[PDB]
C-alpha cells in the first residue's frame, strides 16, 4: 500500500512505533501515541489514519458504539488533510463506509460510497460496493443502475452478476434472475460465496419448477451454507437431532400431544367461533410463500408472548396451553390457528431455526385433497390427531379440496435443547 506521503513520509520511525503498541494489543498506549503526533504532526495523513485505526480497534475491545463513532469521524478527517496518498484515502473511507454500515448509518454509508466512486471512477470494486449501499437503503432502482454500468464495462464480474440477479428476482423477474445468480456463483468471484445467493437461486428455480435446484442446495451444503440439502434454516444450534418427521414419543412431549388430541373439539370450536364472530382476527399469511389461494392465521402466542387480546377470543384453549411451557415459553416459536382454503399452494420453504419442532393439530380436515410434504415425505392431517415435523426442513403445502381446512399449530422447543439453552436463546 502507498500509505506514506511526502508530508507524512519523514516520521516512519515514530509512526512505526505507534503501529507496534497497537499490534501488541496495547491500543491504549497506541491510541494515546498517535494523538500526540496529531498535536505534534497535525497534517500527517498517516498520523490521522492510525488514530482512527486505534480507536477503531479500541471500539472493538470496549465494544462501544460511541467510541466507534469517534473513529468514523476520524477516518473522514484523513480525507480532508491535503497531499494524501490515493491508496491511503481509499483505505480510510472504505473502512468508514463499512463501520457506518455496521452501526446502521446506511444512508451515511451510501453517501461515503458515493464519494469513493467520484474519487476513483475506474475502480469497479467500489462501484460494486456502491450498489450495496443502494440495496441497503431500499433503492433497488439505483442499485440496478450501478450493476448495469459495471457489467457493461465488466461483462463477467460475478459479484455484479449475483447482485444483478438478486435485483431482478426482487422485481418479480424470477426467470431472468436465475442465469445471473448461477453465473455469478460459478465464477467464484470474491463475495459470491454467500449463503444468501444459493438461497435465492434455489428459490427462484423452485418457483419456475426447475428440478435442478436441489443440486444447488446440495452445493450450498457442501459449501457450508446449509445444514443439509433439506435442512436450510439460518439460526441454528449444533448437535440437535435433525429429522424431518417426528413422533410424540420421539419428542418426549407426550402430555402435550395428549391434551391437544383429547381436547381437540374444544380447540376447534373456539377457533371456529373466531372465524364467525371476528373473521378479522385471522390475518393473511406470508404473501411471499402464498403462490395462490387463501391462507390465514390467528395467533395466540408469538415467541413466548401471549397475545392477551387473542386469549380473550379463545379462552379455554389458552388456558389449556398455560399448562405447557415447552410451547408457550418457546421463544423461537408461535402458537396459532391456520386456515387454508381450496386452491391454495404454499411454496417450498423452511423455517428460520432448528430450535423448535412444529406440531399440527387437525381441527377441520376435508376428506380429500389436503397434503403436506416435509423433505421427501408427504402426509395428511386427521381431525383430532397431531403431526410433528422439523419445519427447518423444506416443507410445502397444497389445498385442492372442496372446503376449508383448519389446523392448530403448536411450536415446542427442540427436545434436546437444555434448560439453560432455552433460557439463553434470543427469539
Ligand atoms: O398452515 C399450513 O398448513 C402451513 C404450515 C407451514 O407451512 C408451516 O407450518 O411452517
Author numbering: 331 to 757
What text appears in the publication on this structure?
Aspartate/asparagine-β-hydroxylase (AspH) is a human 2OG oxygenase catalyzing post-translational hydroxylation of Asp/Asn-residues in epidermal growth factor-like domains (EGFDs) in the endoplasmic reticulum. The human 2OG oxygenase aspartate/asparagine-β-hydroxylase (AspH, BAH, HAAH)13 is highly unusual amongst human 2OG dependent hydroxylases, because its Fe(ii) cofactor is complexed by only two residues (His679 and His725) rather than by the typical triad of ligands (HXD/E⋯H) found in other human 2OG oxygenases. AspH is of significant interest from a cancer research perspective, because its levels are upregulated in invasive cancers (e.g. hepatocellular carcinoma and pancreatic cancer) and it is translocated to the cell surface where it can be used as a diagnostic and prognostic marker. Thus, the combined crystallographic analyses reveal that the C3/C4-substituted 2OG derivatives bind AspH in the same general manner as 2OG, with near identical binding modes for the oxalyl-groups and the C5-carboxylates.
In the reported AspH crystal structures, the natural AspH cosubstrate 2OG was substituted for a 2OG competing inhibitor (e.g. NOG, 2,4-PDCA or l-malate),22,41a but an AspH crystal structure complexed with 2OG has not previously been reported. To enable comparisons of how 2OG and the 2OG derivatives bind AspH, AspH was first crystallized in the presence of 2OG with the natural AspH cofactor Fe(ii) being replaced by Mn(ii). Clear electron density corresponding to 2OG was observed; the C5-carboxylate of 2OG being positioned to form a salt bridge with the side chain of Arg735 (2.4 and 3.0 Å) and to interact with Ser668 (2.6 Å), which is part of an ‘RXS motif’ present in some other 2OG oxygenases. The C1-carboxylate of 2OG is positioned to interact with Arg688 (2.7 and 2.9 Å) and His690 (3.3 Å). The C1-carboxylate of 2OG and the 2OG C2-carbonyl group complex the Mn ion in a bidentate manner (1.6 and 2.5 Å). Two water molecules also coordinate the Mn ion (2.1 and 2.4 Å) along with the two anticipated residues His679 and His725 (2.2 and 2.1 Å). Thus, the AspH:2OG structure supports the proposal (based on the AspH structures in complex with the 2OG analogue NOG22) that the active site metal, when bound to the natural AspH cosubstrate 2OG, is complexed by only two AspH residues rather than by the typical triad of ligands (HXD/E⋯H) found in other human 2OG hydroxylases. Superimposition of the AspH:2OG structure with the reported AspH:NOG22 and AspH:l-malate22 structures reveals that AspH adopts similar conformations in all structures and that 2OG binds the AspH active site in a similar manner to NOG (Cα RMSD = 0.21 and 0.21 Å, ESI Fig. S7†).
